[PDB]
Ligand binder design. Sequence first.
Ligand SMILES: CC(=O)c1cc(-c2cc(C(=O)NC3CC3)ccc2C)c2ncccn12
Length: 113
Amino acid sequence: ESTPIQQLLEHFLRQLQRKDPHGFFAFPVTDAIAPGYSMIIKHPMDFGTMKDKIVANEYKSVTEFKADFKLMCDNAMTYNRPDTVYYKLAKKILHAGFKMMSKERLLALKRSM
Ligand SMILES: CC(=O)c1cc(-c2cc(C(=O)NC3CC3)ccc2C)c2ncccn12
């Protein structure tokens, strides 16, 4: 049993995860691999958490999903230095997400529904 919003959100999530083939954004960051992480990042987010929220139907809208996506990227851009693979990849993901879930993109989608 799934719903149209769940299917749409699963599509966006799958498209974004394709940009992170190594799964750096797939699971929560621990302090053991990222020293100090929990002291600097107060609201952690990752793709796996987002997938669980989709499954539990916790997102009422694409706006709420976008907010978690944005948090995940902002966290990575705040914690990691600009030279790192994690920072760079966060910028890539974020740009892809802005393109995919922009207001004009969502308008065109609404037109077709
Ligand atoms: C998003 C973020 O800030 C982040 C993600 C990771 C991460 C890395 C690996 C890994 O396999 N790394 C080896 C290739 C070098 C696995 C799982 C995670 C969560 C990470 N590690 C250190 C500092 C920041 N991060």
